Amino acid sequence: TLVASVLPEDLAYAELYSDPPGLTPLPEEAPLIARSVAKRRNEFITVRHCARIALDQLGVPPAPILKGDKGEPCWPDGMVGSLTHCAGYRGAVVGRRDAVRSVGIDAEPHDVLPNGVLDAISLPAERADMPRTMPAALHWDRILFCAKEATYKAWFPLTKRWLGFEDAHITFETDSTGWTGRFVSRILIDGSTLSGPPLTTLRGRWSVERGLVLTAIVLAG
Numbered sequence: 001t002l003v004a005s006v007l008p009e010d011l012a013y014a015e016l017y018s019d020p021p022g023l024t025p026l027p028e029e030a031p032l033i034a035r036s037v038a039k040r041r042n043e044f045i046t047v048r049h050c051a052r053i054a055l056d057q058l059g060v061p062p063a064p065i066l067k068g069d070k071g072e073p074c075w076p077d078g079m080v081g082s083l084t085h086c087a088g089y090r091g092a093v094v095g096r097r098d099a100v101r102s103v104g105i106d107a108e109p110h111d112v113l114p115n116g117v118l119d120a121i122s123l124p125a126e127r128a129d130m131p132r133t134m135p136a137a138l139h140w141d142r143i144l145f146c147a148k149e150a151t152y153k154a155w156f157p158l159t160k161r162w163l164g165f166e167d168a169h170i171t172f173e174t175d176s177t178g179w180t181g182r183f184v185s186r187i188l189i190d191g192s193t194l195s196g197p198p199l200t201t202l203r204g205r206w207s208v209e210r211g212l213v214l215t216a217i218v219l220a221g
């Protein structure tokens, strides 16, 4: 799998690169996409099948994954997780909450960002400093965006607050060999959480492989 390259039972994952035919949502999930276009129905159904495959590894029976007020997934009791879909990818990573406080993941096509998007998703020091810490000709701008998305998805279940692109400073390193490495997201705003200690730094991993960027953050419980 692609997502295993960005991950450290208590944790499980599943991914697919297409939408297998004949997949259906659970009855509780069907209303959420009753009037949705085909592409949305397909990604929604496939990513939730991945989530149920991953949850099954952790001993959890198949259950619907509904969405909260800010779109966040609703996990079975005692579980945490994250979902992502982009062209050519559906993925789910789930964790046992006693050992895993939060998960955030993201996948994007490994392409340059469209013109204008970089300025909307980055901080000035990231634009200045990140290219030197990253392997050449890789789309560091797209990787930064993915790191911002994994950061928000790991952040939101714990704070239930907005995190803007300007609210976290992300610094990168590259592993000795290959197209992978670590990143650290430092929250610049108050990181108070619903329970437990406040969020300050979130450590994650990034990977470029098979035309996709993957990022993931797994916060220890």
Ligand SMILES: CCc1cccc(CC)c1NC(=O)NC(=N)NC
Residues within 6 Å of the ligand: 148, 149, 151, 152, 163, 164, 165
């Ligand atoms: C315009 C951004 C967007 C639109 C729709 C859905 C999502 C996913 C939650 C996002 N991304 C974020 O809001 N990212 C984020 N705040 N990163 C720090």
Ligand SMILES: [Mg+2]
Residues within 6 Å of the ligand: 084, 085, 086
């Ligand atoms: Mg998507």
Ligand SMILES: [Mg+2]
Residues within 6 Å of the ligand: 084, 085, 106, 107, 149
């Ligand atoms: Mg995304």
Ligand SMILES: [Mg+2]
Residues within 6 Å of the ligand: 109, 110, 211
């Ligand atoms: Mg491509």
